[PDB]
Design a protein around this ligand. Structure first.
Ligand SMILES: *[C@@H]1O[C@H](CO)[C@@H](O[C@@H]2O[C@H](CO)[C@@H](O)[C@H](O)[C@H]2NC(C)=O)[C@H](O)[C@H]1NC(C)=O
Ligand code: NAG
Ligand code: NAG
Lengths: 49, 66
């Protein structure tokens, strides 16, 4: 649900969209994630591993 | 995540893409305030071959009719 459950009722949202908006929060547009999603997913998985 | 008007991706400027199941709208994050998807409300980035989940739809040209 992203951060929506920290304010009121929990609102569903696909994780790629949530991550794109977390990028948009730091000043990088949505297109970066939607064009490198495989790379971000692999990097995050490797970091968690 | 994006719209593919003519073989070319389209991303929301500030909002999300939603739909009634027949028509596609661009709206805010906290309210369902639908607006017709126009080129002034979306920015082009990509070539409609890397984004996953992208739907075709159409956008509205505000200059072609006149
Ligand atoms: C990433 O997810 C995959 C599955 O979605 C995990 O794959 C299995 O993980 C278990 C748990 O260690 C292993 O016993 C299996 O051998 C894995 N199968 C394959 C085909 O890899 C994978 O472990 C996840 N990544 C991490 C770092 O846990
Ligand atoms: C969704 O919006 C469209 C706008 O063109 C409207 O015609 C339709 O009745 C609405 N609802 C559904 C279920 O499509
Ligand atoms: C969008 O239209 C093109 C042109 O016919 C087609 O090749 C493509 O498969 C369509 N995309 C989707 C998601 O239907």
């Amino acid at each position: 649900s992203g951060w929506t459950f920290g304010a009121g009722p929990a609102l569903q949202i696909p994780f790629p969209m949530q991550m794109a908006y977390r990028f948009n929060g730091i000043g990088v547009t949505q297109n970066v994630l939607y064009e490198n999603q495989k790379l971000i997913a692999n990097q995050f998985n490797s970091a968690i591993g | 995540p994006a719209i593919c008007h003519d073989g070319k991706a389209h991303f929301p400027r500030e909002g999300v893409f939603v739909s009634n199941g027949t028509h596609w709208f661009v709206t805010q994050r906290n309210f369902y305030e639908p607006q017709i998807i126009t080129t002034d409300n979306t920015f082009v980035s990509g070539n409609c071959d890397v984004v996953i989940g992208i739907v075709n739809n159409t956008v509205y040209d505000p200059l072609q009719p006149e």
